[PDB]
A paper describes a structure:
We carried out the structural analysis of the flagellar hook isolated from Salmonella in the straight form by cryoEM helical image analysis and built an atomic model based on the 4.1 Å resolution map. The hook was purified from a fliK-deficient mutant strain of Salmonella, SJW880, which produces polyhooks that are structurally identical to the native hook but can grow as long as 1 µm. The final resolution of the three-dimensional image reconstruction was 4.1 Å by the criteria of a Fourier shell correlation of 0.143. Domain Dc is a long β-hairpin (Lys 32–Phe 60) running parallel with the N-terminal helix and with its length nearly the same as that of the N-terminal helix. Thus, domains D0 and Dc together form a compact domain, which we hereafter call domain D0-Dc. In contrast, the Dc domains (green) have close interactions in the −5-start and 11-start helical lines, making a stable tubular structure, albeit the 6-start interactions are absent. Thus, the tubular structure of the hook is stabilized and maintained mainly by the intersubunit interactions of D0-Dc domains alone in the inner core of the hook structure.
The FlgE molecule consists of three major domains, D0, D1 and D2, that are arranged radially from the inner core to the outer surface of the tubular structure and axially from the proximal to the distal end of the hook.
Residue numbers in the entry:
A (entry chain A): 1 to 151
B (entry chain A): 303 to 402
C (entry chain A), F (entry chain A): 353 to 402
D (entry chain A): 1 to 101
E (entry chain A): 1 to 51
Write the structure that this text describes.
């Protein structure tokens, strides 16, 4: 009947490592603390058999804001994730406020995934909120002169 | 720019899930949408239930070391208690086997 | 930007904030150290309870 | 499962030395403060495996200007690097305002 | 929870230097005195976070 | 109340009392820490006396 102890032992091991990751990754950015639920196992007896199984969860509470100022250090309050796109056409979510402009004039994390948003159009540009979440880029090319239309 | 103005380049889109809470952990600090999370709802900072996007800041981990160290120590004691349970059973079984 | 003479730029490091960073980091470091010790102790426990 | 602690430990060590270099090199010229990002490692489990990896960055904010007057002490504001060439025909960039004939 | 102290510490440092510049640049011409406002940070708790 | 101009209210925090609060609280905190250690030590004792 060793399973009635071993199960628990293993669950405890898992718990410790979850804690370990919280501690280690306490120096990371946007990281949300992890934890785990546990539940009683197998019936067919008045006595629980096997005994325990673990279910890992993550608690997305807000962090702090950190008096930074380099790059596009955009923090976010409350709920909300930045919508990122992997170069292979895949959508991901993140609270990684660290953004920088790459050599292609694209906003990315590090990671390296593309920050998306709504496209701008017209002159001056307008935001197409109803449009699909296009990759945000920032051209370094010139504003064309625009004739007076009215005055 | 030099032409004496500000122009819109784009709008950062924010996403909320039904559950936020349910996302599949990946990479660096990346989450994949899941059925548990439901489908992401898109919006902008300050609209609906989408928080604000102040610049000048990083969020930083929400882990509190003053409580994690405690958790760890307690867990270690619990762990050992389980270890004794096993040893207990082992000793017993060995006893049985050899009393014959 | 401009190239005024008569000056050197000098490092942008702010010691009033770096010392703080360091102290905090040291505590964090030790927290990790305990995590390892914890696991080690445990493993040793297991090994010897047999 | 020591890796889930060791990884972090190592990351912390790196962080400390990055800070150490900022402190030491605070007396240098044109030096831009360094830092590092960190990210969660390995899936295949509800629990992060390995745990942490570091990515070093450098924040090029402007420094100060320092009331000097010898040589060709040319400071630079905002963005811009001086274009330098190594005697072996190689191009480099620097904000090292100290120049001499 | 060091951030709840560090934030403030940094703010204080800034304040001091603002004052320092007012003092130093008191000998300049047309210079207008500088100062700074401060505000409370992060919710999600009864206790201010960051600060 | 009245709205006189020419003034800002400024925080009502009194540092002469907050520093005191802090020091006392730290001692209290440590007392709790010993309570935990006490229990831990004890449990370890029990486990190993067998």
């Amino acid at each position: 009947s060793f399973s009635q102890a071993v199960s628990g032992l293993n669950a405890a091991a898992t718990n410790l490592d979850v804690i370990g990751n919280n501690i280690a990754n306490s120096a990371t950015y946007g990281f949300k603390s992890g934890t785990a639920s546990f539940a009683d196992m197998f019936a067919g007896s008045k006595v629980g058999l096997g005994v325990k199984v673990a279910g890992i969860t993550q608690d997305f509470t807000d962090g702090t804001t950190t008096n930074t100022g380099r790059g596009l250090d955009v923090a976010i309050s409350q709920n909300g994730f930045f919508r990122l796109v992997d170069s292979n056409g895949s959508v991901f979510y993140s609270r990684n406020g660290q953004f920088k402009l790459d050599e292609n004039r694209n906003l990315v994390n590090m990671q390296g995934m593309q920050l998306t948003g709504y496209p701008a159009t017209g002159t001056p540009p307008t935001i197409q909120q109803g449009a699909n979440p296009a990759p945000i880029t920032i051209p370094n090319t010139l504003m064309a002169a625009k004739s007076t239309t009215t005055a | 720019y030099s032409n004496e103005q500000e122009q819109v380049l784009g709008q950062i889109v924010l996403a909320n899930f039904a559950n936020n809470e349910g996302l599949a952990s990946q990479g660096d600090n990346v989450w994949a949408a899941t059925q548990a999370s439901g489908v992401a709802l898109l919006g902008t900072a300050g609209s609906g239930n989408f928080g604000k996007l102040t610049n000048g800041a990083l969020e930083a981990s929400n882990v509190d070391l003053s409580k994690e160290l405690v958790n760890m120590i307690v867990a270690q004691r619990n762990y050992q208690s389980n270890a004794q349970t096993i040893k207990t059973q082992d000793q017993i079984l060995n006893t049985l086997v050899n009393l014959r």
